[PDB]
Design a protein around this ligand. Sequence first.
Ligand SMILES: CC(=O)N[C@@H]1[C@@H](O[C@@H]2O[C@H](CO)[C@H](O)[C@H](O)[C@H]2O)[C@H](O)[C@@H](CO)O[C@H]1O
Ligand SMILES: [Zn+2]
Ligand SMILES: [Zn+2]
Length: 401
Amino acid sequence: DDGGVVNITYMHRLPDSEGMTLVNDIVAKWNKQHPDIQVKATKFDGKASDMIKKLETDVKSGEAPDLAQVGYAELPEVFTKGLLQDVTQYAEQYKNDFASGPYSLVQVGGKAYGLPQDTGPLVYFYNKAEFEKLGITEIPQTADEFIAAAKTAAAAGKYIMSYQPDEAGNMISGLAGASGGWYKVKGDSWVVNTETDGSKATADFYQQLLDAKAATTNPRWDPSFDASIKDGSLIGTVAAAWEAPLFMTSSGGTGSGEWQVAQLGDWFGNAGKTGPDGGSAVAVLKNSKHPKEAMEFLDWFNTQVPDLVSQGLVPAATTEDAETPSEWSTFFGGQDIMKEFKTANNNMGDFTYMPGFSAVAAKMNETAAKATDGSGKVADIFSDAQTTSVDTLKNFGLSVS
Ligand SMILES: CC(=O)N[C@@H]1[C@@H](O[C@@H]2O[C@H](CO)[C@H](O)[C@H](O)[C@H]2O)[C@H](O)[C@@H](CO)O[C@H]1O
Ligand SMILES: [Zn+2]
Ligand SMILES: [Zn+2]
């Protein structure tokens, strides 16, 4: 048996903003109950996409945590990098606490490497009051009707879409991928096609919007993006479900009581589906001496549903229903937005990510930014992702067909 006190470390990249139940306050409740398994939780300091680069560094270094947030999209990459610990015999014990889709996303080759934490379906945030003022009385459901509506808004200095070039790798892959995967293993080789009917429909949608100066072009994480909400010019956008509290904070309160959540319209060749943008597991890393207790604490942490929901998470936990925080329904015109998130989750397409997808995402972000001044075409995002996808797999020494 272990010594009397086991010490577990947990690196996460949850927001911990004002009004949320802090990860350290969640963890402190566990620590008080479990003198036998003490947990130290720290928040990664840097850009989200860089966290797994730091994990890679610290695994090699022997400074790595026992547990670390790893996106579903990142898990095949960090697996291939040798950063994870097979914890199948532990995960099996907690499987029934989690929805089965997300659980399957902590697996590589029928071995499990952690537990799922949340999901990222894409939805549509809009200010219904401001849509009314422009005579937009229904969310238009075809790309053509939407683009027409967006041109009307733009003429009044309003925008019912954002183009977020710093997020193309996560959001635009999600949108295109709603209608079909880009990556599949066929026997001995990967088959890559990032230029699906979805990818084409997606490009055409944002291309028309950009050409019409009918979508904002501020990078999502820049002060200018927040400025566009505060000032009231951005009145609609695609967002990942986990953006709800971030968006609310970014608004400074502007439009409070008028905002609404809808399902994505049929704007991206998506045919009634949505797609994933982010969503994460927590993985047990290669050199953790205490996989059992790490997973025991994790199962408890990932089932603290209201606390997780305060972080904007749409939990993978099925142990109790997630509920809309009173602050959020107030902001969102009295709406039970959590119902919309679950509807979106249940209509979300599966999407396999190749190992090395981080390079695909980073390229997509680069090619996306070129379209803002019209020197690149939006379509280029996907032709480039094709070539970067193929080259990254070959660089990993993997076979591409
Ligand atoms: C795919 C990705 O990493 N997107 C980043 C966001 O990460 C999500 O963060 C929420 C918490 O706010 C959940 O943990 C979710 O599962 C993650 O996918 C991150 O919030 C933002 C801002 O730092 O960057 C995105 O790139
Ligand atoms: Zn205990
Ligand atoms: Zn142990």
